[PDB]
Amino acid sequence: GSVQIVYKPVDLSKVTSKCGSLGNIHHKPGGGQVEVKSEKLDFKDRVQSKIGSLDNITHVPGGGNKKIETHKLTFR
Amino acid sequence: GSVQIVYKPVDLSKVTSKCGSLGNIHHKPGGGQVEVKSEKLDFKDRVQSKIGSLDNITHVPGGGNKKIETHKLTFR
Amino acid sequence: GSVQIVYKPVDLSKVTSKCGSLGNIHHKPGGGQVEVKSEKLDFKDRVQSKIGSLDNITHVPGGGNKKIETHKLTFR
Amino acid sequence: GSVQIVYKPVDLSKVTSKCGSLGNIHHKPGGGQVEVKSEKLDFKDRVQSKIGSLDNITHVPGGGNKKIETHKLTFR
Amino acid sequence: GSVQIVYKPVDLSKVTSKCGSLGNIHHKPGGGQVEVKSEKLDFKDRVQSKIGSLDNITHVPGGGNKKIETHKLTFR
Amino acid sequence: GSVQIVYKPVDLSKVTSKCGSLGNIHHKPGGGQVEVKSEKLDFKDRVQSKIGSLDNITHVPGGGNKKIETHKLTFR
Amino acid sequence: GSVQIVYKPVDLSKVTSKCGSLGNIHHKPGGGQVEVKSEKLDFKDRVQSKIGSLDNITHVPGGGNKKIETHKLTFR
Amino acid sequence: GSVQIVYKPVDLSKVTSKCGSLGNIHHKPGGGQVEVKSEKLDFKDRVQSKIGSLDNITHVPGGGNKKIETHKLTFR
Amino acid sequence: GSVQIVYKPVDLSKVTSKCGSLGNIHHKPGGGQVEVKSEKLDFKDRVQSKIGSLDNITHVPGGGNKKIETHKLTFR
Question: Any idea which residues bear Phosphoserine here (chains A, B, C, D, E, F, G, H, I)?
């Protein structure tokens, strides 16, 4: 039939931050082990994997603001 | 038939933060173990996985504001 | 029939940050082991993998702001 | 006076050990911090000292037997 | 006076060890920070000292037996 | 006076070890970090000292037996 | 004392068979599958193992008679 | 003392068979599959192993008679 | 004392067979597949192993008779 779909989302939004001095941050990790013992790995379709990782992250963004959007229109 | 769909969500919202001095932050982890013993792994469709991970994160964003949106319209 | 799809998402949005002095950040990791013992890997289609990684990240962007969009229009 | 001293301690003793297989010893310390914050130090005569130290000792002597003697004769 | 001193300690002693296979010893320290903060140090006579040290010792002597003697004769 | 001293400390002692295979010894330190801080130091007589050390030792003597003696005679 | 053991068992026995025509023997099994799906095998001390064996045996001895003996004399 | 052992067993036994025509023996197994799927094999001390064997045996001895003996005399 | 051992087992036994015509034996197995799929083999001391064997044995001895003996005399 005479099907009609209008997709018109209007976005005027704002993500903002104000900060003074940002600093004097100390990160001193004391080491330590990670250990993974296994047998054969068998990953198939679309698998996402992380094994035995050791991370030490210092992340000091002045802003660090995030806006995430996902506009979707499926028709069949 | 003569079906009509109007999708017009209007967003005028704001996410905001104000801060003075941001600092004098100390992170001193005392080490320590992570340990995983296993047999064969068999991940199939769309599997998401993490094993035996050790993390030390210092995250000091001056703003750090988050806005997440998911506009969706499915038709058959 | 006379099927019609209009996709006109209007975006006037903004991600912003203001910060003063950004500095005096110290990151001093104490080492430590990562260990992964295994048998054969058998990865097939679309697999994403990380194994046995040791990371030390210092990340100090002046802005570090992110805007992510994913517009999608699928038709059958 | 006409003093006489005979010092004739006779030692016929034995310290002994017999051992079969000695092994399969594991020592896995997880790191971690040790810290000393102070004022002026003023150590004097005959001191034996350890300050803020982190130690890991593995000692597997096949014998490890100890015999200690201290013979003394003071005359005035 | 007509003083006489005989110092004839007789030693026939033995320290002994017998051992089979000696092995499969693992020592895996995980790192870490060590810190000593102070003002000026003023150490004097006969001092033995260790400061802020991070140490790992593996000692596997096949024998490792010790015999210590200290013969002393003072006359006045 | 008519003083006499005889110092005849006979010693027929033995320090001994018999050992099989001596091996498969592993030593894997994970690194680390060290800080010692002070305003300029002052150390005097007969000192043994170590500052800010980061030290690994593997010591596998097939004997490693020790005999120590001292035979002090003082006459006044 | 004068311990004595006499071991003098007399065997005069017979194992016997008489048969006419031995034949018109058919062994016609209808085939068929054997299937074993597994993971890693980890056999240690004294293991005796068979996996997936398929046998078709036709055994037609004209006699097939058996006599088994085990004479034993233990002294302490 | 005067310990004495006499081992003098007499064997006059017989294993015997009489058979007429031995024949018209058919062995026609219909084939068939054997399948073994596995991961890594890890056999250690004294392991005895068979995997996937397929046998077709036709055994038609005219006699096939057996006599087995095991004479033993142990002294301590 | 006067220890004595006499070992004089007398064997006058017989294993015998009589058979007429020996023949008209057919062995026609319908073939068939054998399949072994695996990962790496890791065999150590005293391992006895067989993998994937296919056998077709026809054994038609005119006699096929067996006589087995095992005389043993152990002294300590």
Answer: 2, 21, 49, 53
